[PDB]
C-alpha cells in the first residue's frame, strides 16, 4: 500500500472538510436558557435521557442552529464552557410569577458575570405578556409587594408607543425590563450588549426579533475586528 | 537647477517623509506576522498597501528625488523606474478600494461571508497583475537620452498616446476607486447612523475619521496626475524652471498617502 | 460486497468493447480499483487503476494508449473501454479493489471475472509444482529483482490463492499481516529479497495456485505462481 | 438511608491497610531511577531514533 | 438518627489514621535527588484540518495513531508520523467533550452533550466507519466515556456516576455512586482493575471495577477536579483543579504526597498526563501554556510554547516519545 | 535634449 496514496486519501477528506466549513461558517448558533415556567418550549413549538435538542430555522436566507438543553443537573457551570463562541443566547424569562421572578434575575446574573460567556450577547426575551397585563389589570398580585422600589419608579418620556393599552401594563413591564439591563450595564463592559424583547404565547415574529438582534451582534463582531471601535 | 540654499528645504521633506514612510509602514507588517496574526481577508489587503508603500519610499521617493534634483544613468534603471514604482502605486490605490469593499460587506452585509484565503489571493494577485498590465505602455518605451541631466523617457506620437493613455490611467486608477470609495463609506456611515456616548463616538471615530481618508486621496492625487498631460494642453512647454518647484509640491502631496496609511492604522489598528 | 463483471464475448481482432462492474455492498467511492487480467492456462497480469476521486490512472505499458479506465461513482460502476484489441487480450478480467491508508488490507476483495476472447521488478517463483499429502508443513518461496523494503520499514509484498475455479483471494499483505477471514495456518517471513509463505497444517481448501506481488513501483508485477496439488 | 450508606461507606475506608509515606514515596524515587533511561522525554533520544525528525 | 456525627466521628478516624503515617514527606526524601533540568521540547508537527474547538484527544496503543474531537462534529483520526488523515467521522451531536480509542485499535468512542457514548467501528468490511452502538442510559451529560478496558466501556459524568457498560449488550452491568458533583474525569489502571476519577466535589475516588465499590477517597483540593492521570506503575496518581495546583497522592498511603503550585500561575489546569517512567507531570492550563513538572521535586523543569487559546487535552503517548496537545485553536501540536 | 527639458517621472 504505497504512501502517495494515502496522501490522496488525506486530500479528498481535506476537501470534504472545506466544503462542511462554508455551511459551519454561515450558520448562525443559538442557546436556549430558562426555566420551566419559562415558555421556553413554546418558542420552539412556534418556528419553522436526551441531553440537547437542536432546532433548525431559516429566517430570509440564513440558517440557525438552536440549542435548547434539557435532561441535566441542577449546576451548569460546567457545560457552559462548551456554549463559549456562540453567536447569542436566547434567555427566556417569565414574567408573570413574580416569585420566580427574582430568581430568574440571579440566573440571569450568573450569566452575564460568567468567565466564558464575556463576549456573547444576550437576547431577553420577557414572555407572557398576555398574563402580565391581566395581573396588573385585575390589580391583584401586586410587584411592590416583592420589590421595595417600584414605588419610586415612573414611566420615562419615551416608552412603547402601542396601539392601544393600560399606563399601568407600561408602567409595570418597563420595570421588569429595567432590572435585566441594570444587571446588563453594572456587572458588565461594552464587549456584550443585552438586547430585550417583549414576547407573548402565540407569536409569529419571534423569528424575525432573533434576526434584527443577530444582525447587530455580528455588525459589532466586525466592527471590532476592523478596528473601526 | 537646484540652488543649494533652496534644496535644502525640499530635502528636509523627502528624508521626513520617507522615515515616516520605510519606519512606521515597516513596522505595519511585522505587527500583522509575528505580533499578531490576523491571517483571514481582513488584513492580506493591509499588509499588501503596506508592501506598495514600503516600495514607494525606497524606489520612488528617495530615488526619483536624484533625477528631480537633478548622475546615475541606469540604463535598465530607467526600466526598473518606469514599471515597478507605478504598479506599486496602481496597488496601493487598489487595495484601498479592497480595504474599502471588504467593509462594505462586513458592515451593510453581515450575513455574506467573504473570509475565503484562497479567494483572497486571486484577487491581492489579480490587482498585482492588472498594474503590470497598465504600467507597461511606458515601461517599454523608456529610451534614456541626456544632455546634462541623469535620466530620460519618451512616448510614441501621431499627443495621441500621450493624452489618451493618460485619460485612461485617470478614469481608472483615480475615478474608478473613488467612485466606489465614496458609495461604500456613505451607505457605511448611512447604516451606522441609522442604528449612547461610547457608540456614536466610536462611529464619530471610525466613519468621519474614513471620511477625511477619501478627500485626503481625492485632492493628493488630482494635482499630480494633471501634471502628466498639462504640456498637452494649449502651453507646450516643460522647460519654464518654476516646473522643478511645481513637480515637487505635487510629488510630495501624492507620496503623502504613503505616510496617512501607518498613522490611521496606528490610531486604531496598533494602539487600541 | 460483491462485485459483478459484464461485458466480455468474442471480438475480431481491431475492434473495441467495454467492460462493466457494478459493486455493491460497499462505500465504492472510498475504495481504489484495479484491473488483473489472467490468460488462459498462464499468469495473472496488472492492467490498470483508477483511484478514488479519480485523480490518479496509472496503466500498464501493453495496454497504455489503447485501453481506458473510468468510473461512475452515483451509479456505483467501473469501466474498461478497449479500443483495438490484440490477442494478447485474451484473459479473464478481475475487478479488484483496493483501499489506502495506515493499516489498510488493499487488493481484499476481487471480483468474479469475464471471458473476453478475441480471435520493472521482476519477481520469480523458485518453483511452479509441489505435491503435498493433507497434514504437512509447505513453503512457497518467490524472490524480487530490486529489494521490496521501502524506507519507511514495510516491506509490500502481497500473497494471492486462486482455488481452481475461483477468484483470488488475499492471504498476507505486508509481508507478515493475515488477512480477515484466513486462519493462523499462514504465515509469512521474509528478508528484503527473499520472502518465504509457510502454511503449517494443510486442509482441501489450502489447494490452489499460490502468486506473489509487490506494490513499491506500480505497474505491479505477479509471480509465476506456484501450483499446490493432492 | 442516606445516611446509613455514608456511615457503612466510610467503614469501608476506615479499615484500610496503611503503610507509611516514607516506604511510599521511596516506591516512586525507586521506579522513575530504574526506568529513567527508557523515558524519551528526560533523556532525549538522538534524531535516527525519532521518528518526527 | 445519630448517623450524622457518627460520620464526623468516623471522618476523624480516617484523619488519624492518615496523620498517624505521614513521617516525613516527598520533598524530604528526594532532596538529595538530582533535578532533571531544563526541558526544551520543539512542535514537530501541527495538525490542521478541525473547525472548531479541539476537545479531547487520546493516543493509540501503536504510539502512531491519534484520534481528536472537536465541536463542529467530527472526529479525525491522524497519522502522526506523515501529518495524513486516516478517517474522519461525522458525528450526530456537535456537543462532544471525550474521545478514546480501543486498545486493540478496531473502535473509537465519543460522548458529550448529548447522554450517549457512540462506540464506532474501524475495521468494517464495507470499507465506511459505521456506528456500532449507541450506549444511552446515562442522565445528564458524558465527560470521559473514553476509557475502553478491552470490549467494556467505563463512562463518567451527568448523574454524578460512573458506569461499566458491556458494549455487545448494550446495558450497565455496574453503575459507581458517591460522588457528589459533576464527574469530570477518569484514569484506568495499568492492570484494568481499578479506576480513579475526580469530580465537581473536590474529591477524587478509587473505585473497583470487579467489585463496584469505592474502596478510597481523596479531599485535598479545594475546588473541581478537572483532570486525572495515574502514575505508570498504578501506585499513584495526580489532580489538576481549577485553583491552578497539582496534587500528587498516593494510594497505599491513602493522602497527598506533594503540591505542584507557583505563585504565578492563576489558572486552572484543563490536563494532566504523566512520562513513561514518571517523573514528568505535564499539565495544560486555562491559559496557553503547558507546563512540565519535576513529580519528584515539585518543580517547573519546562514550559511547552504557545497555543493561541485553551489547551484542553493533554497526552503522552504509550512510547514515551511524543507529547500531543490540543487547545481551542483548533490545532493539535505534537511535541519532543 | 539640446538646450532644455524636463522630464519628471511617476
Known amino acids: 500500500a504505497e504512501d502517495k496514496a494515502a496522501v490522496e486519501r488525506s486530500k479528498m477528506i481535506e476537501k470534504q472538510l472545506q466544503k462542511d466549513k462554508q455551511v459551519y461558517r454561515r450558520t448562525l448558533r443559538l442557546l436556549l436558557l430558562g426555566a420551566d415556567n419559562s415558555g421556553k418550549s413554546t418558542i420552539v413549538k412556534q418556528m419553522r435521557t436526551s441531553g440537547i435538542f437542536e432546532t433548525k430555522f431559516q429566517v430570509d436566507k440564513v440558517n440557525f442552529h438552536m440549542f435548547d438543553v434539557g435532561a441535566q443537573r441542577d449546576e451548569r457551570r460546567k457545560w457552559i464552557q462548551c456554549f463559549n463562541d456562540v453567536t447569542a443566547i436566547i434567555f427566556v424569562v417569565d414574567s408573570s410569577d413574580y416569585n420566580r421572578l427574582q430568581e430568574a434575575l440571579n440566573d440571569f446574573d450568573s450569566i452575564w458575570n460568567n468567565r466564558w460567556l464575556r463576549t456573547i450577547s444576550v437576547i431577553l426575551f420577557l414572555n407572557k405578556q398576555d398574563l402580565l397585563a391581566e395581573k396588573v389589570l385585575a390589580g391583584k398580585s401586586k410587584i411592590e409587594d416583592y420589590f421595595p422600589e417600584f414605588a419610586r419608579y415612573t414611566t420615562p418620556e419615551d416608552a412603547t408607543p402601542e396601539p392601544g393599552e393600560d399606563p399601568r401594563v407600561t408602567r409595570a413591564k418597563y420595570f421588569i425590563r429595567k432590572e435585566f439591563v441594570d444587571i446588563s450595564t453594572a456587572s458588565g463592559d461594552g464587549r456584550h450588549i443585552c438586547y430585550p424583547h417583549f414576547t407573548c404565547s402565540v407569536d409569529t415574529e419571534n423569528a424575525r426579533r432573533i434576526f434584527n438582534d443577530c444582525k447587530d451582534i455580528i455588525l459589532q463582531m466586525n466592527l471590532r475586528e476592523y478596528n473601526l471601535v | 537647477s537646484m540652488p543649494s540654499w533652496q534644496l535644502a528645504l525640499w530635502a528636509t521633506a523627502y528624508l521626513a517623509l520617507v522615515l515616516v514612510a520605510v519606519t512606521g509602514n515597516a513596522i505595519v507588517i511585522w505587527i500583522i506576522l509575528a505580533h499578531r496574526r490576523m491571517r483571514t481577508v481582513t488584513n492580506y489587503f493591509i499588509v499588501n498597501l503596506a508592501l506598495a508603500d514600503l516600495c514607494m519610499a525606497a524606489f520612488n521617493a528617495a530615488f526619483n528625488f536624484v533625477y528631480a534634483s537633478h548622475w546615475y544613468f541606469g540604463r535598465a534603471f530607467c526600466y526598473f523606474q518606469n514599471l515597478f514604482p507605478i504598479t506599486a502605486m496602481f496597488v496601493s490605490i487598489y487595495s484601498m478600494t479592497a480595504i474599502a469593499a471588504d467593509r462594505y460587506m462586513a458592515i451593510v452585509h453581515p450575513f455574506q461571508p467573504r473570509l475565503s484565503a484562497p479567494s483572497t489571493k486571486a484577487v491581492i494577485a489579480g490587482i498585482w497583475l492588472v498594474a503590470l498590465a497598465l504600467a507597461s505602455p511606458q515601461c517599454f518605451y523608456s529610451t534614456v537620452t541626456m544632455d546634462q541631466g541623469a535620466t530620460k523617457c519618451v512616448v510614441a506620437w501621431p499627443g495621441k498616446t500621450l493624452l489618451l493613455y493618460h485619460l485612461v490611467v485617470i478614469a481608472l486608477i483615480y475615478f474608478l476607486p473613488l467612485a466606489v470609495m465614496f458609495v461604500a463609506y456613505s451607505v457605511i456611515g448611512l447604516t451606522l447612523w441609522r442604528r449612547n456616548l461610547r457608540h456614536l463616538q466610536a462611529m464619530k471615530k471610525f466613519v468621519k475619521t474614513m471620511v477625511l481618508v477619501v478627500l485626503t486621496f481625492a485632492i493628493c492625487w488630482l494635482p499630480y496626475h494633471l501634471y502628466f498631460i498639462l504640456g498637452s494642453f494649449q502651453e507646450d512647454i516643460y522647460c519654464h524652471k518654476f516646473i522643478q518647484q511645481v513637480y515637487l509640491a505635487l510629488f510630495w502631496l501624492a507620496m503623502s498617502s504613503t505616510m496617512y496609511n501607518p498613522i490611521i492604522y496606528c490610531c486604531l489598528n496598533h494602539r487600541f | 460486497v460483491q462485485l459483478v463483471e459484464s461485458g466480455g464475448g468474442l471480438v475480431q481482432p481491431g475492434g473495441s468493447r467495454k467492460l462493466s462492474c457494478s459493486a455493491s455492498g460497499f462505500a465504492f467511492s472510498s475504495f481504489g480499483m484495479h484491473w488483473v487480467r489472467q490468460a488462459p492456462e498462464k499468469g495473472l497480469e496488472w492492467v490498470a487503476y483508477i483511484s478514488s476521486g479519480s485523480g490518479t490512472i496509472y496503466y500498464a505499458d501493453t495496454v497504455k494508449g489503447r485501453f481506458t479506465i473510468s468510473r461512475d461513482d452515483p451509479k456505483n460502476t467501473l469501466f474498461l473501454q478497449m479500443t483495438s484489441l490484440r490477442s494478447e487480450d485474451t484473459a479473464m478480467y478481475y475487478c479488484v479493489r483496493s483501499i489506502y491508508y495506515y493499516g489498510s488490507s488493499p487488493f481484499d476483495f476481487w471480483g468474479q471475472g469475464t471471458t473476453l476472447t478475441v480471435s520493472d521488478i521482476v519477481m520469480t517463483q523458485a518453483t511452479s509444482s509441489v505435491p503435498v499429502t493433507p497434514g504437512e508443513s509447505v513453503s512457497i518461496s518467490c524472490r524480487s529483482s530490486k529489494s521490496l523494503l521501502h524506507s519507511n520499514g514495510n516491506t509490500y509484498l502481497y500473497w494471492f490463492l486462486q482455488r481452481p475455479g475461483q477468484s483470488p483471494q488475499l492471504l498476507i499483505y505486508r509481508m507478515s499481516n493475515l488477512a480477515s477471514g484466513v486462519p493462523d495456518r499462514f504465515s509469512g517471513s521474509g528478508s528484503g529479497t527473499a520472502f518465504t509463505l509457510t502454511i503449517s497444517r494443510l486442509e482441501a481448501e489450502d489447494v490452489g495456485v499460490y502468486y506473489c506481488m509487490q506494490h513499491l513501483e506500480y505497474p505491479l508485477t505477479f509471480g509465476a505462481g506456484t501450483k499446490l496439488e493432492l | 438511608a442516606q445516611a446509613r450508606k455514608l456511615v457503612e461507606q466510610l467503614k469501608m475506608e476506615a479499615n484500610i491497610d496503611r503503610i507509611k509515606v516514607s516506604k511510599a514515596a521511596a516506591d516512586l524515587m525507586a521506579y522513575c531511577e530504574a526506568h529513567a533511561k527508557e523515558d524519551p522525554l528526560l533523556t532525549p533520544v538522538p534524531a535516527s531514533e525519532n521518528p518526527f525528525r | 438518627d445519630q448517623l450524622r456525627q457518627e460520620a464526623e466521628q468516623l471522618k476523624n478516624q480516617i484523619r488519624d489514621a492518615r496523620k498517624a503515617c505521614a513521617d516525613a514527606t516527598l520533598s524530604q526524601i528526594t532532596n538529595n535527588i538530582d533535578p532533571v533540568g531544563r526541558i526544551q521540547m520543539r512542535t514537530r508537527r501541527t495538525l490542521r484540518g478541525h473547525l472548531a474547538k479541539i476537545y479531547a484527544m487520546h493516543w493509540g496503543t501503536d504510539s502512531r495513531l491519534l484520534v481528536s474531537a472537536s465541536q463542529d462534529g467530527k472526529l479525525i483520526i491522524w497519522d502522526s508520523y506523515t501529518t495524513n488523515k486516516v478517517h474522519a467521522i461525522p458525528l450526530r451531536s456537535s456537543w462532544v467533550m471525550t474521545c478514546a480509542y480501543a486498545p486493540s485499535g478496531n473502535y473509537v468512542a465519543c460522548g458529550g452533550l448529548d447522554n450517549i457514548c457512540s462506540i464506532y467501528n474501524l475495521k468494517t468490511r464495507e470499507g465506511n466507519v459505521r456506528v456500532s452502538r449507541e450506549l444511552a442510559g446515562h442522565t445528564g451529560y458524558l465527560s470521559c466515556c473514553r476509557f475502553l478496558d478491552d470490549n467494556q466501556i467505563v463512562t463518567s459524568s451527568g448523574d454524578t456516576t460512573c458506569a461499566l457498560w458491556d458494549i455487545e449488550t448494550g446495558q450497565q452491568t455496574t453503575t459507581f455512586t458517591g460522588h457528589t458533583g459533576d464527574v469530570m474525569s477518569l484514569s484506568l489502571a495499568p492492570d484494568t482493575r481499578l479506576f480513579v476519577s475526580g469530580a465537581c466535589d473536590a474529591s477524587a475516588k478509587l473505585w473497583d471495577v470487579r467489585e463496584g465499590m469505592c474502596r478510597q477517597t481523596f479531599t485535598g483540593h479545594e475546588s473541581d477536579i478537572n483532570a486525572i492521570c495515574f502514575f505508570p506503575n498504578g501506585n499513584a496518581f495526580a489532580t489538576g483543579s481549577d485553583d491552578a495546583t497539582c496534587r500528587l497522592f498516593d494510594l497505599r498511603a491513602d493522602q497527598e504526597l506533594m503540591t505542584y503550585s507557583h505563585d504565578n500561575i492563576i489558572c486552572g489546569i484543563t490536563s494532566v498526563s504523566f512520562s513513561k517512567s514518571g517523573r514528568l507531570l505535564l499539565a495544560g492550563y486555562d491559559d496557553f501554556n503547558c507546563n512540565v513538572w519535576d513529580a519528584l521535586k515539585a518543580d517547573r523543569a519546562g514550559v511547552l510554547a504557545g497555543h493561541d487559546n485553551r489547551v484542553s487535552c493533554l497526552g503522552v503517548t504509550d512510547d514515551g516519545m511524543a507529547v500531543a496537545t490540543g487547545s481551542w485553536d483548533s490545532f493539535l501540536k505534537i511535541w519532543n | ?10
Open chain 6, 1 to 10: 535634449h539640446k538646450t532644455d527639458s524636463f522630464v519628471g517621472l511617476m
